[PDB]
Amino acid sequence: SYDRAITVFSPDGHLFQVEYAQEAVKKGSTAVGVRGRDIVVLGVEKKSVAKLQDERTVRKICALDDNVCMAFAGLTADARIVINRARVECQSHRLTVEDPVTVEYITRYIASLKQRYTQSNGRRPFGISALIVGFDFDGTPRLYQTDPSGTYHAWKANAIGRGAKSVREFLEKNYTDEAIETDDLTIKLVIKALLEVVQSGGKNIELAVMRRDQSLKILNPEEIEKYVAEIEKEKEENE
Amino acid sequence: YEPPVPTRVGKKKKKTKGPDAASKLPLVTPHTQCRLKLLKLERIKDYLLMEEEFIRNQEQMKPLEEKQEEERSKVDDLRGTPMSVGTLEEIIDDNHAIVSTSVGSEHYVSILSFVDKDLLEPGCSVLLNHKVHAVIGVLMDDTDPLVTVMKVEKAPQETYADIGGLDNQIQEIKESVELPLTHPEYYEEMGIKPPKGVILYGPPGTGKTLLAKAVANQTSATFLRVVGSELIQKYLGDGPKLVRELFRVAEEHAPSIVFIDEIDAIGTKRYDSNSGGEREIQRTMLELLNQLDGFDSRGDVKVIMATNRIETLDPALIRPGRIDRKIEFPLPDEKTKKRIFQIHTSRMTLADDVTLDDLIMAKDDLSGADIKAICTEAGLMALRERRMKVTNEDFKKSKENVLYK
Amino acid sequence: LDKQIKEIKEVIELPVKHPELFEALGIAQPKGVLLYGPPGTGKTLLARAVAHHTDCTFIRVSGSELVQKFIGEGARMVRELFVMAREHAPSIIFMDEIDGDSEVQRTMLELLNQLDGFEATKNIKVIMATNRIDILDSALLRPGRIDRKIEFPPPNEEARLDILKIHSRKMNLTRGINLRKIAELMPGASG
Amino acid sequence: STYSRQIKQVEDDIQQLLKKINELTGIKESDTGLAPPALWDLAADKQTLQSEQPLQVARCTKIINADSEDPKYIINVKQFAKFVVDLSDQVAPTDIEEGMRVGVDRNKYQIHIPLPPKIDPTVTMMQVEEKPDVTYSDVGGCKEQIEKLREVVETPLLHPERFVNLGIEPPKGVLLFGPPGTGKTLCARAVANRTDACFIRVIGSELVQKYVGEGARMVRELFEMARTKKACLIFFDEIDAIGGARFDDGAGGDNEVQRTMLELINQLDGFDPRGNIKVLMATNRPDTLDPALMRPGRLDRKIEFSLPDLEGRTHIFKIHARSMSVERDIRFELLARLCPNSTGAEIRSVCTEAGMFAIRARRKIATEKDFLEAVNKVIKSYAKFSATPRYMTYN
Amino acid sequence: YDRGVNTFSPEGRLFQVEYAIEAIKLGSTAIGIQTSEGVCLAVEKRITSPLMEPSSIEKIVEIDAHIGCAMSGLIADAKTLIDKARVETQNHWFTYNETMTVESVTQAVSNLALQFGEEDADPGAMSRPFGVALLFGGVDEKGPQLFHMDPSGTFVQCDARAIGSASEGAQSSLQEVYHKSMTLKEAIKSSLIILKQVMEEKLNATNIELATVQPGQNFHMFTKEELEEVIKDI
Ligand SMILES: Nc1ncnc2c1ncn2[C@@H]1O[C@H](COP(=O)(O)OP(=O)(O)OP(=O)(O)O)[C@@H](O)[C@H]1O
Ligand SMILES: Nc1ncnc2c1ncn2[C@@H]1O[C@H](COP(=O)(O)OP(=O)(O)OP(=O)(O)O)[C@@H](O)[C@H]1O
Ligand SMILES: Nc1ncnc2c1ncn2[C@@H]1O[C@H](COP(=O)(O)OP(=O)(O)O)[C@@H](O)[C@H]1O
C-alpha cells in the first residue's frame, strides 16, 4: 500500500497540493450556475468544439439524482470519480432516509470526500470544483460550490473555471430580483454571463435547466440560439 | 621616512561622466519667451561680457611663454611622443601613482599637473611618457566589443500597434519601463519608486520578446539584450564576471533597460563547455541576485526578463525588490487570434476565397508565432508559384507545414 | 539535390537579390535555414554553393577556440561574430551539428534571437546542418524561428548516378563505364 | 512672442561668447584625459620631470650583513631582473624589511622609497567609497536584530573605551540569515551608511575565479588591505557562493571554491591574529555553510532575519508608505494582517502597487482599496513565485 | 520533500505542527469570552462576494446542546474534528447517561491532533495535522468553560481567547476589557466591539456569527434580529 503524505503544510501554513489542485480548476471550462426563483440554470463553456466529437459523451453537466445536478471545472477524469461516488451516496441516502437527498447533503458529502483526499496518505487532492444546483423537498432552489480544499458555500450565482473572476464580477452586477423574475430571464442571465468569456458565441455554450418537480433538461442548440438572438436583440434597444 | 598621504578621499574616480564641463550655464526659468527670461538671459550675458574682458586683459599682459596656445604647445612637449599606454595599479599620492607598462614592469611615476586626476582609477588605462613614464594622460577607453553586443544600436521596427490582444500586458510593462521615464512626475507626486523589475512569462510564441521589441522601439533609454544561455561561460567565474559587466554597461548608459531574454535557459540547459556544472550556474545566479537588488546602489536601470519556464527559476531571483511585476502571456483566444492574423496579413494581398475565421481554428493551442509562421509560409508558397496573391490553398498547405510534420 | 537547390534559393537567394518580392508579398524575409539528413548527403555542399552563387560571405561557426582570436579577444558571446558578419553582408552563418546539450544548437538560438528583430543590417542569413530533426530543441522547432527546414535524404539510384557522374570526371576513365550498374551496387549510400 | 526675436539674439551671443571664452580658456581634448587648464602648473611639471627621477617597482628579498655598516639588499625587479643593491642615503636602513616592495632608480637600482603592498585592483574597488542612502530608520521590525548588529559592528568602533576598561573582547563577526527580502542586505547598507571605519563589500560570487588558487589569493589580499586600516568592516554578501560545506564526491567537486572558503576561515581565526576587522556575512542559505565558518571566532553572532511579525509588518508598512500620498484612515494594521508570512520586500511592493493603481486611475491619493488590491496582486496573486516557503526550510 | 511529517526541528519543534499553526493566521478572527453567566463565541464570516450566501458559512457549530465550537484556520479540516466531538458526545451519553464535560470533549478532540504520520499507520490515518484552531465553549458541572485547541493537540482553559488572523490585536483588546465579574451581555457587546475594529468589512448582522451557552439555557446561535439588537449599540 502506497502510504506517503502527498499533501503537507508549507512553512507559511499552506497546503500546496490543494492550491495546485485549485490551479487545475482554473484551467477548465467556465461553469456558470444561477439560482432563480423556481429554476436553477447551469451553463458550461465548451472547449474547442470539434465537428467529429460526440457531444453526448463529453458532458460537464451530470445529474447526481432526479433533483440534484452538478457542473464541474478541472480534471475531467477526476470529476467522473466524484460524480459516481456522489451518485452512489444519493441512492444510499434514499435507501436509508426514504427521502430524496438535499443539495446541502450531497455538497457536504462531496466536500468531505474532497477534503479526505487532502489529508489521506497516498492520495492527491481532487482537481475539480463542483457547481451543485438542485431543489429540496420543500421546493427551495439551492446552489452550492465546492473546491478541492473541501469548502462548500451557497451562492445565489457563481462561476468556476478559467474565467470565473470575470463572470463572477459580471454576475455581482447583474444578479437582481428583476433579473430572476421569470425563467427566461434567468436562462438569459447565464448566457449573458457565459458570453463574457466565450468568444465565438452560443455554439460554445452548453445549457442545462432544472425546474421544480422536474428532471434536468439539456437545452438543444436551436433553443440556445433562440436565446442569444434575444440578448442580441435587447442589446440594440439599450443603445 | 613617512608614507605619503593623499588629499583626495578614496581611490575611485568621480562618478559623474560625460557632463557639460564648464558650459553648465545656470538653468534659466521659465522657458516662455518673456521679459523675465530676457532679463535672466541678459544677466548671464552680462557676466560673460565681464568674463571676456577680464580674461583678455590678463592674457594680454601674460608673458609670451604663458599663453593659451603656448602652454598647450608646452604640454605636448612635456607629454612627448610616443605616448605609452599603461595600466594604473595604485594611486600612492595625489601626484604619484604606480603604473605598469604592457611588458608587465611596474613603475613608481609622477602624475603631472595637466592630467585629469578625477578619471584616475585602479585598472584604468593611463598614458605615460615614453622616457620618464610619468603619468601624462588617461586613455578614454574605447567601447568594448562586449558593449557592442548588448547594445541594440537601432530600435526594432515592431511597435505596440503590431501587438494584438496583450492590452493588459502592454499596460503593465509600460508602467515600469516606459511611464517612469516619459512622465516621472506621476511617481514623484505619489511618493512611490517605480516597479523595480519585470518578468514576462508564458507559453512559447506568446509575444514575450515582441513586447520587449516594442519597448525597445519606443524607449529613450539604452537597451541591452542578453539571452540567458549567454550567461553560461566556458570558464569558472566568467559567468559571474559577465553578469557583473553587463550591469556595469547599464550603469554607464543610464537610463537603461536590460532585457535578460530566456533567463530560464541558464539552468534548464546543461553544456559540457561549462566547466563548473550546476554549481557555477548557481554562482552566476548569485551574481545576478546582487545586481538586481544588492549592496551596490542601482541607478536608472530597469530589468526585463523573459522565460517560458518560470517554475525552473530560482524563487529568490524573481522575488519582489528584484522583479516586482510578473506579467503572464497566455495563448491567444479567438478575439486575439483574429487580430494577430490581421496584423500579419495587413501588408499581404489576399484572395477573396480566403477567410481568417477558418484559419482561427487551425489548432486549439495556437500561438502568435504559429499564426505568423502560417502567413510567411503561405506567402512563400505563393512565391514558389510566382504569385503575389495568397490563396486559401496556400494557407492550407501552410498549416500542414508549420503545425504538423 | 535539384529540389533542395530550389528550396534554399527561395529563402537565401531571393531575399538577398530581390527584397521587393517579399515586400510585395508582405511577408518577412527568411533568416533561418535548417538542412537535415544523413551525414554526407550534401548539406554543407549546398550551403557553400548558395553562398558562392549569391556572393554571400560564408562563415562556418564550429565554436573552435583556435579561431577565437579572429572572432574577437573577448570571446564571451558568439554574437561577437556579428561584427564581422555585418562587415561582409550579405553573409551566411553556417553551423553543422556533428552529433550535455548541443553547443551548435545553443549558438543557433543566440544568433536567431538577435536576427529576430534586434539586428539592424539585413542580408545576414543563418544555416544549421543537423543529422536529425527530432533531436532538435523545442526552441528551434518552434514556428517562426527556422523559416524553412530542408531535408537531404540519402541519394536514391538515380541521384547516386548523378553524384557518381560528378566525381568520376576528376579521373582518367576508360570509355564505356557503366556508372548506372555501380549506382545499383550501392543501396543506401551517401554522396 | 514679443521677446522671441531678442531672446534668440542674446542666446546666440551667449553661445558665441561661450565659444569665445573656450577659445581663450580652453575646454577641449578630454579624450587623452587632459585636465582643464585652470589646474595646469606647467612650471612645476617641468621641474618634476628633471628633479624627480622615475622609480622602478621592486621587491626586497634578502638583506645581506644587516648587522654591519654595509647592508646589501637583493631586489626582484618584477620581470626585468634581480639585483644586489645598496640602500640610498636619503632613507633609513630600518625602513626597509625583507619581502617589502621598494622603489629603485634605473641607474644603480638603489632603493629610494618603500612602497605599499600590492593589492589587486578588483580588491581595491571592493571598499565602499560612497555610503548608501539607507539608515536604520528604513529597517522595520528588526529592533532586536539591529541592536545585536550594532553592538558588535558599530559600538566597539564608536566607543571602544567601554570595552577595554571591563576587559571585554567584543565579537568580531556577525552572520545575517533569513529568507530573501527579509532585510539582510538592507541592514548592511545601513551599517555602511552609519559606519566611520573602512567598509569593504565583498560578494561571494566575486571571489570565484578562473584559475587555481586565485580565489584564495583575493581573500588574502582582502584581509591584507583591511589590516592596513585602524578599524575595518568586511561585508560578505551571499557567502553561500563560497562558504559551502566541504565534501568529497570522488571527483574534485567544488575543491577550488572550498580552498577560498578555507582561506577565509584562516584569516578570520587562524595562527595569526585577524586584527581590528569585524566581518559581516549575509546569506539566505545558512544551512549550506561550512561548520568551520559557522563557528564562533569567525561568525560569533548569528542574527536571524525572520519574516516580520504583525508589529514589524505594520512598521515596515509605515516606513514605505511614509512618503506616499495615502488617504486618511489607511488601516495599516489590517494590511499587515492580510499578509501573515510576508517579507519586507513584498510590503514595499504592496506600497508601490497600491500607488500604482492610483496612478492607473489618474488619482493623486492612494485609497485603502488600492492597498487591498495591491495585497491581492502581490501577496496572493504572486504567491506562486514566492521564495518564502522554500527558504524557511533553509533558514 | 525529504522531510517526513513526523520530523523534529533542531529547536525541538514538530515542523508540520508549527506549519499548521501558521495556517490559523490566515483564518478568520474568532473571539471567545467565558463569563459567570455563560460563554460567548463570535467569529467573522469574511464574505468575499455578495452572491455568497452568508448563512452557508458555518463557523460556529453545535457540538451538543451544552457545548459549541468556534473554528478558525482551514474550515474544511475542522469538520473532521467537529464530527467526532459530536460523536464522542452522544457516546458519553450512551455509556454514562450524562453530558460530557467541556474539558473532556476538548481532550478527546485534542488526541486526534498528532495522530498523523507517513509510515506504520492505519489506512484511515491522517497524513498532516489539522490546520484549524477550535474555541470550545459550553456549560457543565464547573459552570461556563471556554477551551482553546490548536493543531498541536494542546488544549487549555481560557477566560477570553481570540484566535484567527487578528488573534494578536484582539487578545490585547480582550485583556483590556475582560474582568472576571462581568455579565454575558457585556461579553456579547465587548466581543463585537473588538471584532468590528479588526474586520476588513463593515460590521453588520450578516457577516458575523454569535453563539452563547448560558447555564440552564441551551446553545443558541444569534439570529439576524438578535444580532441587529446588539449591533445597533456598537
Ligand atoms: N500577441 C501577438 N500579437 C502579434 N504578434 C504576435 C503576438 N504573439 C506573437 N506574435 C508574433 O510571434 C512572433 C514570435 O513570437 P515571440 O518572438 O514574441 O515569442 P516569445 O513570446 O518571446 O516566446 P519564446 O521566446 O518563448 O519562443 C513575433 O515576432 C510576433 O510577430
Ligand atoms: N525590515 C525591513 N524594513 C523595511 N524595508 C525592508 C525590510 N526588509 C526588506 N525591506 C525592503 O525589501 C528589499 C529587499 O532587499 P534586501 O536587500 O533587504 O533583501 P535580502 O534580505 O538581502 O534578500 P536576499 O536574501 O535575496 O539577498 C529592501 O531593499 C527594502 O526596500
Ligand atoms: N549530393 C551530392 N552531390 C555531389 N557531391 C556530394 C553530394 N553529397 C556529398 N558530396 C561530396 O561529399 C563531400 C562531403 O559532403 P558534405 O556536404 O560535407 O556532407 P554533409 O551534407 O553531411 O555536410 C563533398 O566534398 C561533396 O563533394
Ligand SMILES: [Mg+2]
Ligand atoms: Mg523569445
Ligand SMILES: [Mg+2]
Ligand atoms: Mg559533415
Ligand SMILES: [Mg+2]
Ligand atoms: Mg542580499
